[PDB]
Amino acid sequence: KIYTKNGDKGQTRIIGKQILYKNDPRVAAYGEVDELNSWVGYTKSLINSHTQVLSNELEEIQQLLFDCGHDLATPADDERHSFKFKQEQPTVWLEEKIDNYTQVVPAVKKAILPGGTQLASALHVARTITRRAERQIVQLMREEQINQDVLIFINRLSDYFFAAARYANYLEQQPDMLYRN
Amino acid sequence: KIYTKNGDKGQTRIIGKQILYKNDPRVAAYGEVDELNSWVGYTKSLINSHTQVLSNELEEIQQLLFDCGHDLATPADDERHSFKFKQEQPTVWLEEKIDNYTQVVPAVKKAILPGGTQLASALHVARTITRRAERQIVQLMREEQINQDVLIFINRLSDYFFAAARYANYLEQQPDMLYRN
Amino acid sequence: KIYTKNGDKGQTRIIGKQILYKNDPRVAAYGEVDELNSWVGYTKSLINSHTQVLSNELEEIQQLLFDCGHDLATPADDERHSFKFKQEQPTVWLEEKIDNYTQVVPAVKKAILPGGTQLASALHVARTITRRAERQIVQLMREEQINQDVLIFINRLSDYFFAAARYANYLEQQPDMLYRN
Numbered sequence: 010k011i012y013t014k015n016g017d018k019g020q021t022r023i024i025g026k027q028i029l030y031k032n033d034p035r036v037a038a039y040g041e042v043d044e045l046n047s048w049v050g051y052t053k054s055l056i057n058s059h060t061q062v063l064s065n066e067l068e069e070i071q072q073l074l075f076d077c078g079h080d081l082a083t084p085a086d087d088e089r090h091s092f093k094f095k096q097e098q099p100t101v102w103l104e105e106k107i108d109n110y111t112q113v114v115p116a117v118k119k120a121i122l123p124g125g126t127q128l129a130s131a132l133h134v135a136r137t138i139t140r141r142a143e144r145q146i147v148q149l150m151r152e153e154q155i156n157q158d159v160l161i162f163i164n165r166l167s168d169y170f171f172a173a174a175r176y177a178n179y180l181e182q183q184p185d186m187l188y189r190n
Numbered sequence: 191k192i193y194t195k196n197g198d199k200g201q202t203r204i205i206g207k208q209i210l211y212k213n214d215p216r217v218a219a220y221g222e223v224d225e226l227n228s229w230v231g232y233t234k235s236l237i238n239s240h241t242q243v244l245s246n247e248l249e250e251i252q253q254l255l256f257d258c259g260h261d262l263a264t265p266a267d268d269e270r271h272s273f274k275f276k277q278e279q280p281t282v283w284l285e286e287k288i289d290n291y292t293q294v295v296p297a298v299k300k301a302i303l304p305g306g307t308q309l310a311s312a313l314h315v316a317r318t319i320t321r322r323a324e325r326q327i328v329q330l331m332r333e334e335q336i337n338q339d340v341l342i343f344i345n346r347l348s349d350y351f352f353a354a355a356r357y358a359n360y361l362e363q364q365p366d367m368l369y370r371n
Numbered sequence: 372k373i374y375t376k377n378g379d380k381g382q383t384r385i386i387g388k389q390i391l392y393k394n395d396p397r398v399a400a401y402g403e404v405d406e407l408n409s410w411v412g413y414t415k416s417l418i419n420s421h422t423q424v425l426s427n428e429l430e431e432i433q434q435l436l437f438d439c440g441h442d443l444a445t446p447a448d449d450e451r452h453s454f455k456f457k458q459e460q461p462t463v464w465l466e467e468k469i470d471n472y473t474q475v476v477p478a479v480k481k482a483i484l485p486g487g488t489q490l491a492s493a494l495h496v497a498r499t500i501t502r503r504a505e506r507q508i509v510q511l512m513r514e515e516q517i518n519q520d521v522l523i524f525i526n527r528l529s530d531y532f533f534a535a536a537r538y539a540n541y542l543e544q545q546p547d548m549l550y551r552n
């Protein structure tokens with residue numbers, strides 16, 4: 010059964026099987042990445058005919074987030090369990106999308122309100138959940154050795170979600186709204 | 191008026207009327223349960239003709255979450271205020287649903303990406319918000335005596351949301367996607 | 372480029388340019404306000420013909436939340452950067468809406484389940500995210516001097532979202548459901 014009940018008193022296992030409390034900074038870090046991954050799934054479910062071009066990359070992000078979570082759940086000192094996530098290829102992939110979407114949409118010099126279409130608005134929610142997960146990752150980094158490649162990718166990912174949100178509005182001919190002061 | 195302004199300097203009351211700061215671990219715990227309850231309401235609003243079978247149980251979860259929040263807001267040592275939540279019946283109810291939904295959907299041996307239909311994706315968001323609330327409950331448990339029955343139910347509840355998310359995809363003939371490595 | 376990479380090791384700048392870790396209580400506070408602002412954008416995107424009357428005020432809240440975030444990112448002691456947010460006018464505006472929406476909808480004497488229409492349910496999610504951001508603001512207040520006007524408005528704002536959620540249900544002829552005990 011998926012329910013083992015071993016977590017009923019508030020403790021759980023990480024990779025390698027060491028037991029931690031569920032509020033441990035490590036468990037909060039990969040838990041927030043799981044929350045982000047679920048929100049990306051929700052965002053993907055809002056795609057329509059006008060925004061289908063974004064579907065493949067959202068699913069790829071979900072696969073990458075699983076790799077990131079895996080590494081966050083992995084203690085550095087247990088040599089039986091290696092980190093799997095390498096930032097270079099996925100991060101350059103995000104950057105290419107950021108550059109492309111920044112070029113195509115109307116240039117702004119002011120902050121935008123996070124909103125517009127349902128999909129663009131969901132991409133802004135994704136942007137802010139990514140940044141929340143990043144804060145938890147940094148809390149963990151300050152106490153334990155982490156795969157720093159995960160932090161590089163998670164940082165870049167919220168810039169991706171910002172650029173993708175603007176692109177989603179552009180795909181539905183929805184202008185962005187500027188902050189008034 | 192619902193606005194009393196007594197909370198304007200960042201303090202508030204729990205059951206029994208003792209005053210705590212709004213960032214107190216207790217207030218964060220039942221606040222996260224309120225956030226979960228609101229997300230379950232949102233998830234319920236996404237039900238359609240194909241997924242109506244899930245409506246009653248989502249509303250029942252909302253009623254149960256109110257009982258859970260009540261107990262988390264109740265200090266153990268104030269004998270004027272008793273715990274109301276007893277885990278056995280609601281938890282066995284969740285387990286029966288987990289068993290039923292696990293049986294009906296295609297068996298997997300790999301992790302799934304959290305996503306699919308809008309409803310299944312919302313049920314995965316519910317799964318991860320439940321787990322976030324659980325972490326806050328454990329933070330509170332480590333400082334204060336709690337109704338441990340709430341923790342048992344909240345633990346089981348995120349396994350319910352996982353099984354229900356797979357079932358929602360099944361109800362709309364949407365396959366789950368496997369993690370690639 | 373929007374990606375500078377200066378945040379790749381988990382530190383970032385606030386207003387005035389001092390560097391903090393991304394898990395610093397200040398950065399968590401205005402980060403949670405950004406998350407709220409994105410959720411308000413998402414909520415606004417769910418408006419339909421029956422609920423158009425709520426569109427202007429949601430966008431106004433988004434502009435106000437930017438002012439609030441600005442002040443939370445501003446250290447009190449750096450006199451080069453003044454607080455911009457003054458609570459009186461926006462807070463009285465919220466209160467007038469609370470009074471109006473409380474009058475129009477069916478009176479209750481019991482707690483309601485947070486749910487109903489998709490929009491009303493999203494307004495309850497907004498209510499609980501506002502309250503989460505409030506907890507982070509109070510964490511910051513307990514360590515650093517803040518613009519206390521932001522806390523007054525953020526407190527009142529979750530009462531606004533509660534009253535607006537009930538009003539959204541009323542606009543679509545959806546009754547609220549009461550807590551059963």
Ligand code: B12
Pocket residue numbers: 010011012013015022023024025039040042043075077078079080081082298299300301302303304317348349350352371
């Ligand atoms: C880390 C981990 C995860 C991570 C995975 C990635 C990450 N790090 O962020 C996260 C937090 C996402 C996760 C989620 C869940 N998991 Co998990 N997970 C673990 C854990 C602790 C380690 C697995 C491991 O060592 N892998 C290391 C490598 C070398 O092996 P691997 O084959 O590549 O491992 C993969 C699988 O374990 C897979 N996976 C992870 N969880 C689950 C759950 C199920 C049902 C399946 C089929 C596969 C699977 O992901 C791993 C790759 O990253 C184990 C504990 C244990 N006793 O095994 C549980 C454990 C496997 N997971 C469990 C469960 C129940 C869940 C959830 C259903 C919980 C929930 N209600 O949300 C979810 C959703 C699963 C999904 N999406 O399909 C149970 C499964 C019990 C069972 N007999 O079915 C276990 C055994 C824990 C327990 N309670 O004892 N989990």
Ligand code: B12
Pocket residue numbers: 191192193194196203204205206220221223224256258259260261262263479480481482483484485498529530531533552
């Ligand atoms: C605990 C509590 C809650 C909990 C309830 C369950 C939980 N523990 O998680 C939570 C956090 C969910 C909650 C939410 C809210 N509450 Co409240 N709640 C309290 C509190 C602290 C204790 C109530 C109590 O002692 N009950 C113990 C038992 C023995 O009595 P009871 O009749 O069963 O109590 C029930 C009611 O209080 C009901 N309830 C809880 N909140 C509210 C709000 C309203 C308007 C109504 C009609 C009923 C109601 O839930 C209780 C059962 O669990 C009081 C403080 C106080 N001064 O009374 C406020 C208080 C009742 N709540 C208040 C408010 C405004 C709210 C919110 C509208 C805040 C918001 N903006 O989100 C929401 C939403 C309410 C809803 N869904 O209808 C105000 C009501 C003021 C008024 N005159 O209308 C109070 C008085 C606090 C205050 N500011 O002084 N709250």
Ligand code: B12
Pocket residue numbers: 117118119120121122123136167168169171190372373374375377384385386387401402404405437439440441442443444
């Ligand atoms: C505070 C701040 C914010 C706050 C704004 C309000 C708040 N306090 O909550 C928040 C957290 C919301 C924010 C968000 C983002 N920001 Co910002 N922000 C800052 C910061 C630290 C201070 C700005 C300042 O001093 N203003 C003070 C007053 C006197 O000047 P001002 O003209 O009124 O400032 C306004 C603009 O800066 C505007 N703004 C804020 N961020 C951004 C980003 C862009 C692209 C634009 C055009 C405008 C803009 O908001 C301010 C008014 O409150 C700077 C750091 C820096 N080096 O400048 C970055 C910085 C401007 N932001 C940056 C970025 C990338 C972002 C995000 C895209 C990050 C993301 N992926 O989510 C988002 C979204 C922006 C949006 N909605 O359009 C980058 C811009 C780099 C570039 N060359 O494009 C900067 C330079 C930080 C960095 N990485 O070096 N940020």
Ligand SMILES: Nc1ncnc2c1ncn2[C@@H]1O[C@H](COP(=O)(O)OP(=O)(O)OP(=O)(O)O)[C@@H](O)[C@H]1O
Pocket residue numbers: 011012013014015016017020021022023024031036037039040082320321322324325345346348349
């Ligand atoms: N509340 C939580 N937040 C984040 N991560 C969690 C949480 N609970 C468990 N985990 C992590 O996710 C994995 C799968 O969760 P699962 O709920 O199966 O664990 P458990 O709660 O320890 O056991 P069980 O639910 O069977 O009693 C755990 O092995 C642990 O690594």
Ligand SMILES: Nc1ncnc2c1ncn2[C@@H]1O[C@H](COP(=O)(O)OP(=O)(O)OP(=O)(O)O)[C@@H](O)[C@H]1O
Pocket residue numbers: 192193194195196197198201202203204205212217218220221263501502503505506526527529530
């Ligand atoms: N930010 C918050 N997060 C979680 N729980 C809260 C928060 N603020 C208040 N509470 C809890 O929810 C109850 C209802 O909230 P409410 O906003 O009415 O309280 P308040 O902020 O203390 O008062 P007011 O908003 O009238 O100034 C409170 O009595 C307290 O138990």
Ligand SMILES: Nc1ncnc2c1ncn2[C@@H]1O[C@H](COP(=O)(O)OP(=O)(O)OP(=O)(O)O)[C@@H](O)[C@H]1O
Pocket residue numbers: 139140141143144164165167168373374375376377378379382383384385386393398399401402444
């Ligand atoms: N994870 C986060 N959570 C909340 N606020 C953040 C976070 N990261 C950065 N900030 C704040 O938001 C502003 C804009 O974020 P941005 O991502 O551009 O910053 P950075 O991560 O420091 O730099 P970069 O992403 O270019 O490496 C920052 O200047 C800082 O004030």
Ligand SMILES: [Cl-]
Pocket residue numbers: 089
């Ligand atoms: Cl071994």
Ligand SMILES: [Cl-]
Pocket residue numbers: 118119120188190
């Ligand atoms: Cl600006």
Ligand SMILES: [Cl-]
Pocket residue numbers: 270
């Ligand atoms: Cl008494």
Ligand SMILES: [Cl-]
Pocket residue numbers: 299300301369371
């Ligand atoms: Cl797997």
Ligand SMILES: [Cl-]
Pocket residue numbers: 451
């Ligand atoms: Cl200067």
Ligand SMILES: [Cl-]
Pocket residue numbers: 480481482550552
């Ligand atoms: Cl009640």
Ligand SMILES: [K+]
Pocket residue numbers: 011012013014349
């Ligand atoms: K489990």
Ligand SMILES: [K+]
Pocket residue numbers: 083084085086087088089090091092
């Ligand atoms: K290792």
Ligand SMILES: [K+]
Pocket residue numbers: 192193194195530
């Ligand atoms: K109130």
Ligand SMILES: [K+]
Pocket residue numbers: 264265266267268269270271272273
């Ligand atoms: K008691």
